[PDB]
């Protein structure tokens, strides 16, 4: 995903996502149907 596409899917930057606890990162990936 591009940075802009990442922000559109997750509503946050890549760097913001990396600051989330792993459990929430994984929650969001499943929720959005990605990686």
Curated annotation (Swiss-Prot):
Outcome when changing residue 23 to A: Loss of F-actin binding
Annotated region (Absolutely required for activity), positions in chain: 29-32
Cellular localisation: Cytoplasm, Cytoskeleton; Cell projection, Microvillus; Cell projection, Lamellipodium; Cell projection, Ruffle
Disulfide bridge partners, by residue number: none
UniProt modification remark: Phosphorylated on tyrosine residues. The unphosphorylated form increases the initial rate of actin-nucleating activity, whereas the tyrosine-phosphorylated form inhibits actin-nucleating activity, enhances actin-bundling activity and enhances actin-severing activity by reducing high Ca(2+) requirements. The tyrosine-phosphorylated form does not regulate actin-capping activity.
Tissue expression notes: Specifically expressed in epithelial cells. Component of brush border microvilli.
Comment text on domains: Consists of a large core fragment in the N-terminal portion and a small headpiece (HP) in the C-terminal portion. The core fragment is necessary for both actin-nucleating and -severing activities, whereas the HP binds F-actin strongly in both the presence and absence of calcium and is necessary in actin-bundling activity. The Gelsolin-like 1 repeat is necessary for the actin-capping activity. The entire core fragment is necessary for the actin-severing activity.
Self-association state and partner proteins as the record states: Monomer. Homodimer. Associates with F-actin; the association with F-actin is inhibited by tropomyosin.
Family the UniProt entry places it in: Belongs to the villin/gelsolin family.
Function: Epithelial cell-specific Ca(2+)-regulated actin-modifying protein that modulates the reorganization of microvillar actin filaments. Plays a role in the actin nucleation, actin filament bundle assembly, actin filament capping and severing. Binds phosphatidylinositol 4,5-bisphosphate (PIP2) and lysophosphatidic acid (LPA); binds LPA with higher affinity than PIP2. Binding to LPA increases its phosphorylation by SRC and inhibits all actin-modifying activities. Binding to PIP2 inhibits actin-capping and -severing activities but enhances actin-bundling activity.
The protein's name: Villin-1
Gene encoding the protein: VIL1
Whole-protein residues included: 792 to 826 of 826
